[PDB]
Amino acid sequence: LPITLQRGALRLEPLVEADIPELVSLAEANREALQYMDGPTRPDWYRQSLAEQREGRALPLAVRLGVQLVGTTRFAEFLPALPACEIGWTWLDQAQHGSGLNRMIKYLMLKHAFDNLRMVRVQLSTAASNLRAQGAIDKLGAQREGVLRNHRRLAGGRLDDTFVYSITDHEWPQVKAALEASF
Amino acid sequence: FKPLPITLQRGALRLEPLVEADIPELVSLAEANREALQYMDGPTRPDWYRQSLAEQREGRALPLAVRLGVQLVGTTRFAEFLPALPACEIGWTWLDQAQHGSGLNRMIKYLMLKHAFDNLRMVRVQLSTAASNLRAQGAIDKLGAQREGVLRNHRRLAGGRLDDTFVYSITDHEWPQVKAALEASFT
Ligand SMILES: CC(C)(COP(=O)(O)OP(=O)(O)OC[C@H]1O[C@@H](n2cnc3c(N)ncnc32)[C@H](O)[C@@H]1OP(=O)(O)O)[C@@H](O)C(=O)NCCC(=O)NCCS
Ligand SMILES: CC(C)(COP(=O)(O)OP(=O)(O)OC[C@H]1O[C@@H](n2cnc3c(N)ncnc32)[C@H](O)[C@@H]1OP(=O)(O)O)[C@@H](O)C(=O)NCCC(=O)NCCS
């Protein structure tokens, strides 16, 4: 079920059709930053996430900081029987990199997955080539679970492997603690 | 990317698209094999089968009935399509116990892999099973798939226990050697 997540001027709100033109314009200005992701520069990647939201299979979000739309992120790949999900499909306008915005977003999202939704597992994933997102996943305290070969494309169409990580419900108290103490 | 509902065949073996008509018969057979199926979540209830047909109605699965001449002997599936690649998983396989150790599992994956790589032009086929499911890990190892990771709290077993998942793959580059080995094991 759709949620708005907020801390002060930071709002994560369900993605809507009206957000798409601006996200595509914002992604063009960040074209090079988005090089390890396939889709975010095209409307179909956003429309796909809203299709899935309708089918109860994703919760995509618009990231707003004050008045300004600064990116997007998503819960998806639900495993209802566990429950489990993945958090990802995140990009942020590059003025926000290094700011702590990503850590805060991930803290609000994990806190929802574990404290409210009762997830037993949360997966995070990124391209083998994406050294920045890897560092950022590390900093969360997610543990690497695997390397999936020939599992993705980069923005220019090149094939890449995926690094897969997770946080389990047992690890979450210490993950929560560690993040909160970095604020 | 549009995988269509194909029949695969080798001699008296056919893999034919699963239909609703198959499900009563599959459910009774799985019940007969209840304990062999204990590492899988759901194959003894009709809903597991309709869920696959529903996914198929969406272009998200290709569920299959396994037949030896006219005998129904189990089920298997292509699913988790990654259209941009293209890639999929081959899985959700169970055979009747009389066929355990007959080489039927291997011939089934051989037909499926040939179709994935040779017809659908996939760059990756994934296989996965419970961390507890040693026999399946053996058959996967035997196919020539390389283990890629262990995913924690990633599944439930037949009685609802949480288990991890071992994840494997065969890439398009490994396929020829895998094919060669499979072909040699049959012949
Ligand atoms: C992935 C993303 C959301 C992470 O947010 P971020 O604010 O940049 O992340 P952080 O700065 O908090 O963490 C990145 C860490 O990796 C390290 N790092 C940054 N660039 C690096 C590089 N090229 N090589 C190795 N390490 C690098 C940094 O040192 C930093 O850690 P530090 O604080 O100890 O120095 C963001 O960078 C982004 O939107 N990228 C563009 C789109 C994308 O690739 N999406 C991610 C796919 S999941
Ligand atoms: C999984 C299944 C389809 C495999 O077919 P199979 O005929 O049983 O497999 P094979 O005999 O070809 O391979 C089993 C391999 O596991 C290993 N092995 C055999 N028995 C084992 C055991 N009980 N414990 C650990 N390893 C074992 C060996 O490598 C063996 O190969 P071998 O012929 O060299 O001895 C079948 O067991 C089945 O339908 N099981 C129930 C459903 C299920 O668990 N689904 C699998 C989901 S991926």
| Cβ proximity of B177 and B142 under 8 Å | no
| C-alpha distance across the termini of chain A, in Å | 28
Q: Is the Cβ of A175 closer than 8 Å to some Cβ of chain B?
A: no
What are the structure tokens assigned to B6, written together? Answer: 């194909």
Distance of CA A102 to the CA centre of its chain: 9
- Tokens 């618009």 sit on residue: A62
The one-character DSSP state at B19 is -
Distance of CA A96 to the CA centre of its chain: 15
Does any ligand 1 atom lie closer than 6 A to the CB of residue A158? no
Approach to solving: X-ray
Query: Which CATH code, of 3.40.630.30, 3.40.50.40, 3.30.360.10, 3.20.20.70, is assigned to A1-183?
Result: 3.40.630.30
d(CA A125, CA A87): 8
Which residues touch B118 (CB under 8 Å, ≥6 apart)? none
Query: Which CATH code, of 3.40.50.150, 3.40.630.30, 3.40.109.10, 3.20.20.60, is assigned to B1-187?
Result: 3.40.630.30
d(CA B153, CA B174): 29
Q: Where are the domains positioned within chain A?
A: 1-183
Which residues touch B51 (CB under 8 Å, ≥6 apart)? B42
Q: Is the Cβ of B13 closer than 8 Å to some Cβ of chain A?
A: no
Is residue A141 helix, strand or coil? coil
Q: What is the Å distance from ligand 2's center to B73 Cα?
A: 16
Residues of A in contact with B154 (CB under 8 A): 79, 82, 84, 121
Residue nearest to atom 22 of ligand 2 (CA): B135
Report H helices in chain B: 23-32, 46-57, 104-114, 134-143, 175-186
What are the structure tokens assigned to A120, written together? Answer: 């037993």
Which residues touch A51 (CB under 8 Å, ≥6 apart)? none
